[PDB]
Amino acid sequence: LVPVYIYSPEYVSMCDSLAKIPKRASMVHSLIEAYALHKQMRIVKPKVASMEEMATFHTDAYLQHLQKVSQDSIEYGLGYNCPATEGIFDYAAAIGGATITAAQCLIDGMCKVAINWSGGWHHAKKDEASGFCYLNDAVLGILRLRRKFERILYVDLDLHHGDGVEDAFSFTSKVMTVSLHKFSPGFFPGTGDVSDVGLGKGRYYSVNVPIQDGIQDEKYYQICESVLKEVYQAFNPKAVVLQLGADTIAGDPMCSFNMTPVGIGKCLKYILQWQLATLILGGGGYNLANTARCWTYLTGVILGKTLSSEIPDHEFFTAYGPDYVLEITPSCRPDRNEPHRIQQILNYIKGNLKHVV
């Protein structure tokens, strides 16, 4: 009954090697640990994903190519965004197996919530890398949950549209994907408008909520709670995979949304309250200190605790200036979401869900 935490020194050290988020893994860990939150969690060492576990989603041509490259390259999306970095195959296997490992505990009753903050790589296609994602651990995690669960719900709270995971299940009704991302022409990955609902046997089993800059905690929680309520109704899931990219939080260099760890928490609370199994994943988050602040605070609402406002002294204390507090103050930027558009969106979504059995 104690939340599982996927950690291991070798793992975190492996993740700190990710180009875009250097040392972000350590920062998140050490901050969560400096709050002694790991004392109230079942620490589980992550297992490396095997070539056959990754093959449950990715093609051999892709996986083998990714492997040879790990030692004509821009063939499988391995270009500007996803470079042919030496050792990526090993980094992705570690992160992928870290989610497979967390998924297994959920289908073992060993816990009702497993956490893998270093995961959440939602852009990767079965045979294509995208948006710094070489392997789609979110899909590998959901496919593992399918061993014991019939209806799995995937909620993507990342600033970006979880296309990789949506594409994976766009033709199926066994897994429903919900994504609240910023949608605007020329913004990555450019998909996910509200009209996007899935194909074939999976029509309407894909929900997309396009948002605009500036949105804040309450405006966001209303939209999220609203959509998550209608969804639990029609789909009535058995397990839940939650992607919590912190690139929505105020202060991120992404400078799009204007959330705080508490806005997301209200959403997290609302989902945890369904008492269904739950696989927590990180994702984007480009303001290192803030990301540790957000996920630590969230590892706090997962344990019903209320963390200390003053940031405990630790390994990376200095990176928490100039105030050294766990709270994030929203930026003074205008919300660009006209309330009428949010309604048209919510209705269109509402009428898209009636079609569910």
Ligand SMILES: CN(C)c1ccc(C(=O)NCCCCCCC(=O)NO)cc1
């Ligand atoms: C200043 N500089 C060198 C850059 C600035 C912006 C990008 C970018 O937006 N790239 C597009 C990829 C967006 C990240 C998607 C991964 C993600 O956040 N998933 O949730 C790249 C480089």
Ligand SMILES: [K+]
């Ligand atoms: K689907």
Ligand SMILES: [K+]
């Ligand atoms: K999203």
Ligand SMILES: [Zn+2]
């Ligand atoms: Zn993102």
